[PDB]
């Protein structure tokens, strides 16, 4: 219940050589926080600005470490526990994950794990991508959703599955379909729109769109214009809202507000609300669930 005590992030799960390992020092910290938790994790391709956006949710210009090269930067899964801006006695647990698709690691399977863990530990899951919603992205989602079930196994009065938010970065297109205007949320609905008919494939189509809309209780989508611009992008955290594109600042604001006011408390199947100790448990159960027996 302590006083705003987490200066910066800390690796919660280590990722070395295809070996995900819970970090004791973080687990030691979780066992200390007894307040209920609102966990928010982000996931998406590497080098898509995930950490930078996760900081905005912490209200600090500095926090989750960024990188400005073509090389994967955030490794494993990081946690940052901070007082909840809108819920007293609540703890906002921010989770930053290792980017997907790094061509130096080239480990689809290893990605599947981090991705899955993130969904398993969140109460609000944020899927971050550039420009648009892709089928490939939407397929990866579906796969991990299923992979998430398998994992739970080796471990319907109001679920405990995470709410969902899809973030679109450096957006640069009109955002309108079939001559008729769209809002982020509608665009996301449009992409998950089921196929009115039937067919061997006319169904293999909406198959994922079913599970995705079923798995994630609530959905939401936010668009984000490219922060500042080329040349200033490698120094984004120093620059203040002044030098940044207004549109973005607004987009970030509206996103944080959405999160601060709608992200639910993490609850275990049974209704029990998740807190430091219970979260520390979930990790171990899952990390150990992963690895070892298939």
Ligand X SMILES: Nc1nc2c(ncn2[C@@H]2O[C@H](COP(=O)(O)OP(=O)(O)NP(=O)(O)O)[C@@H](O)[C@H]2O)c(=O)[nH]1
- Binding of ligand X by 245 (CB under 6 A): no
The correct pick among 74, 129, 148, 251 for binding Mg ion (CB under 5 A) is 74
- Minimal distance in Å, beta carbon 51 to ligand X? 3
**Of 157, 160, 208, 165, nearest in space to 37 by CA:** 160
The correct pick among 15, 20, 29, 52 for binding ligand X (CB under 6 A) is 52
Residues ≥6 apart with Cβ < 8 Å to 156: none
**Of 59, 61, 64, nearest in space to 74 by CA:** 64
- Minimal distance in Å, beta carbon 68 to Mg ion? 11
Q: Which does 182 bind (CB under 5 to 8 A by kind): Mg ion, a copy of itself, ligand X, none?
A: a copy of itself
Q: Is 238 annotated as a binding residue?
A: no
Q: By rule CB under 6 A, what string of x and - marks binding of each residue 129-158 to ligand X?
A: ------------------------------
Q: Is 19 annotated as a binding residue?
A: no
How is residue 23 written in tokens? 């970090």
CB 115 within 8 A of CB 140: yes
- When computed from its CA atoms, the radius of gyration of the chain, rounded to whole angstroms, is 19
Residues between 95 and 124 that touch ligand X (CB under 6 A): 99
Residues between 40 and 69 that touch Mg ion (CB under 5 A): 51
**Distance of alpha carbon 89 from the chain centroid:** 23
Nearer to a copy of itself, 143 or 260 (CB): 143
Pairing label, strands 180-181, 176-177: antiparallel
The correct pick among 1, 70, 177, 234 for binding ligand X (CB under 6 A) is 234
- Minimal distance in Å, beta carbon 258 to a copy of itself? 21
Candidates 23-31, 46-54, 139-147, 205-213; binding stretch for ligand X (CB under 6 A) = 46-54
CB 122 within 8 A of CB 40: yes
Q: Is 63 annotated as a binding residue?
A: no
Residues between 184 and 243 that touch Mg ion (CB under 5 A): none
Distance CA 38, CA 9 (A): 16
**Of 189, 194, 190, 217, nearest in space to 205 by CA:** 194
Q: Is 49 annotated as a binding residue?
A: yes
User: What DSSP element (H or E) covers 248?
Assistant: helix 246-262
Q: Which does 52 bind (CB under 5 to 8 A by kind): a copy of itself, ligand X, Mg ion, none?
A: ligand X
Q: Which does 70 bind (CB under 5 to 8 A by kind): ligand X, Mg ion, a copy of itself, none?
A: a copy of itself
- Binding of ligand X by 85 (CB under 6 A): no
Which DSSP category does 45 fall into?
Answer: B
- Binding of ligand X by 50 (CB under 6 A): yes
Q: Is 48 annotated as a binding residue?
A: yes
CB 120 within 8 A of CB 282: yes
Q: By rule CB under 6 A, what string of x and - marks binding of each residue 168-187 to ligand X?
A: -xx-x---------------
Distance CA 136, CA 133 (A): 9
How is residue 159 written in tokens? 């679920």
**Of 284, 200, 293, nearest in space to 21 by CA:** 284
**Of 18, 61, 60, 57, nearest in space to 41 by CA:** 57
Q: Which does 108 bind (CB under 5 to 8 A by kind): Mg ion, a copy of itself, ligand X, none?
A: a copy of itself
Q: Which positions touch Mg ion (CB under 5 A)?
A: 51, 73-74
Instruction: Please state the residue numbers annotated as binding site for GTP.
Output: 44-51, 66-68, 96-100
């Amino acid at each position: 219940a302590s006083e705003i005590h987490m200066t910066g992030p800390m690796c919660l799960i280590e990722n070395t050589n295809g070996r995900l390992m819970a970090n004791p020092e973080a687990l030691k910290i979780l066992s200390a926080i007894t307040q209920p938790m609102v966990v928010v994790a982000i996931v998406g391709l590497y080098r898509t600005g995930k950490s930078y956006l996760m900081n905005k949710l912490a209200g600090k210009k500095k926090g989750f470490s960024l990188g400005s090269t073509v090389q994967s930067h955030t490794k494993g899964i990081w946690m940052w526990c901070v007082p909840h801006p809108k819920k007293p006695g609540h703890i906002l647990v921010l989770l930053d994950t290792e980017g997907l698709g790094d061509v130096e690691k080239g480990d689809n399977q290893n990605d599947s794990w981090i991705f899955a863990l993130a969904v398993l530990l969140s109460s609000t899951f944020v899927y971050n991508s550039i420009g648009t919603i892709n089928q490939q992205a939407m397929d990866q989602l579906y796969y991990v959703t299923e992979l998430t079930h398998r994992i739970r196994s080796k471990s319907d009065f109001v679920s405990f599955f995470p709410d969902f938010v899809w973030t679109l970065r450096d957006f640069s297109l009109d955002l309108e379909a079939d001559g008729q205007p769209l809002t982020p949320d509608e665009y996301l609905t449009y992409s998950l729109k089921l196929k009115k008919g039937t067919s061997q494939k006319d169904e293999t189509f909406n198959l994922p769109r079913l599970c995705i809309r079923k798995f994630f209780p609530k959905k939401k989508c936010f668009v984000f214009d490219r922060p500042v611009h080329r040349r200033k992008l490698a120094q984004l955290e120093k620059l203040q809202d002044e030098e940044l594109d207004p549109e973005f600042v607004q987009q970030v604001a509206d996103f944080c507000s959405y999160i601060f006011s709608n992200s639910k408390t993490k609850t275990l199947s049974g209704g029990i609300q998740v807190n430091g100790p219970r979260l520390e448990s979930l990790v171990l159960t899952y990390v150990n669930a992963i690895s070892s027996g298939d």
